[PDB]
Amino acid sequence: VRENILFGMGNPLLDISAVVDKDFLDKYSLKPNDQILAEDKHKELFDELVKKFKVEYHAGGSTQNSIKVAQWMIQQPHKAATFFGCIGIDKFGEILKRKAAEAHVDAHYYEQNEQPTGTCAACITGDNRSLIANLAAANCYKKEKHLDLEKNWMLVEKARVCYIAGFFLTVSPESVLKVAHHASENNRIFTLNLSAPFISQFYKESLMKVMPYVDILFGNETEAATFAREQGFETKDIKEIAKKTQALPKMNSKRQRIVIFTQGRDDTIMATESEVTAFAVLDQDQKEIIDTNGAGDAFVGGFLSQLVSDKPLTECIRAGHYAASIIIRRTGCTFPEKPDFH
Numbered sequence: 001v002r003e004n005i006l007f008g009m010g011n012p013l014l015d016i017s018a019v020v021d022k023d024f025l026d027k028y029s030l031k032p033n034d035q036i037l038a039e040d041k042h043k044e045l046f047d048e049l050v051k052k053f054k055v056e057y058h059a060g061g062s063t064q065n066s067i068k069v070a071q072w073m074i075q076q077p078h079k080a081a082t083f084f085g086c087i088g089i090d091k092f093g094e095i096l097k098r099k100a101a102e103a104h105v106d107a108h109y110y111e112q113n114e115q116p117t118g119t120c121a122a123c124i125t126g127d128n129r130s131l132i133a134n135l136a137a138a139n140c141y142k143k144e145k146h147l148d149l150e151k152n153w154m155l156v157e158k159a160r161v162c163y164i165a166g167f168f169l170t171v172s173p174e175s176v177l178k179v180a181h182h183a184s185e186n187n188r189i190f191t192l193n194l195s196a197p198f199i200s201q202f203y204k205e206s207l208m209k210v211m212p213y214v215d216i217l218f219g220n221e222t223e224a225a226t227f228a229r230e231q232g233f234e235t236k237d238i239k240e241i242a243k244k245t246q247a248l249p250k251m252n253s254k255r256q257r258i259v260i261f262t263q264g265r266d267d268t269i270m271a272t273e274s275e276v277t278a279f280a281v282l283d284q285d286q287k288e289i290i291d292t293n294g295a296g297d298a299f300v301g302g303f304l305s306q307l308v309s310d311k312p313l314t315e316c317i318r319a320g321h322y323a324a325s326i327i328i329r330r331t332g333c334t335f336p337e338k339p340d341f342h
Ligand SMILES: Nc1ncnc2c1ncn2[C@@H]1O[C@H](CO)[C@@H](O)[C@H]1O
Pocket: 010, 011, 013, 014, 015, 035, 036, 037, 059, 060, 061, 062, 063, 065, 120, 131, 133, 167, 168, 293, 294, 295, 296, 297
């Protein structure tokens, strides 16, 4: 509808990808398909990747990807979607700012110089992708230094829908809570992503602190299974987990929670107050698949583009499947000049 109607915040990261071999995964004790945070023991990993293999660089970060995709589907006006995050004052940081602008997103960064711009290694093997996030500057986001400044907070107050990936809970749970409480107080929509199994395992306390404020929860089938185990649900059935998650304690009685769990090429599951329904993924051709992680970010971006236009949930799901089908066959969450969705 109008400028700054959709708000997002998270970790701005420059993706570094390359096809590697079994020896490289074994050397760093990497699982073929996984997403983890970079420890001190992984400093060797990033240098060896860039020195032993052919790498490509693409602007990334989960929430940033979803916001760029939402803006793409909205088309007009420019700057309908806002994004906040922290970066370094370097060449990598200039790449991220340049790409956010070309995407027509209203991006406002917290720039500092103690830490370099964050990066994320994507170690590819065939149809598998092992991700390692070295947050660096991204982990320096401080609400008192950015989110709380008058000029920035005003942008959050213009939003009708807010979205933050669960990944940001490892950096600023206080920022996530300030935004979630504001939405609850002003009967606006607050949405969140489970993001990765490690969020439901090691950061479950911050996750459960924010849950009462979550109007719409997104996640894939492995994140749903981990969340169920850690919360003691005692079931591994995706439809039952969606039902129990939907029923969790909620603050704002004016909006019932909606839970959406994707299952790759299998049906997308949606739980509402009254039932649990399934939506087929009609794009079944596997041949040209490239990036399933980015496909999940694009699914959320498509869904959000229709939620701000006030469309039925059926249409939000169709838009999510459409955007995921475009991004899944490309690198760097890129897409054609204009969407073909009416
Ligand atoms: N800890 C993290 N925080 C934010 N984004 C992440 C994290 N780990 C992986 N990603 C992102 O996931 C995206 C693909 O889904 C990549 O662009 C990558 O940068």
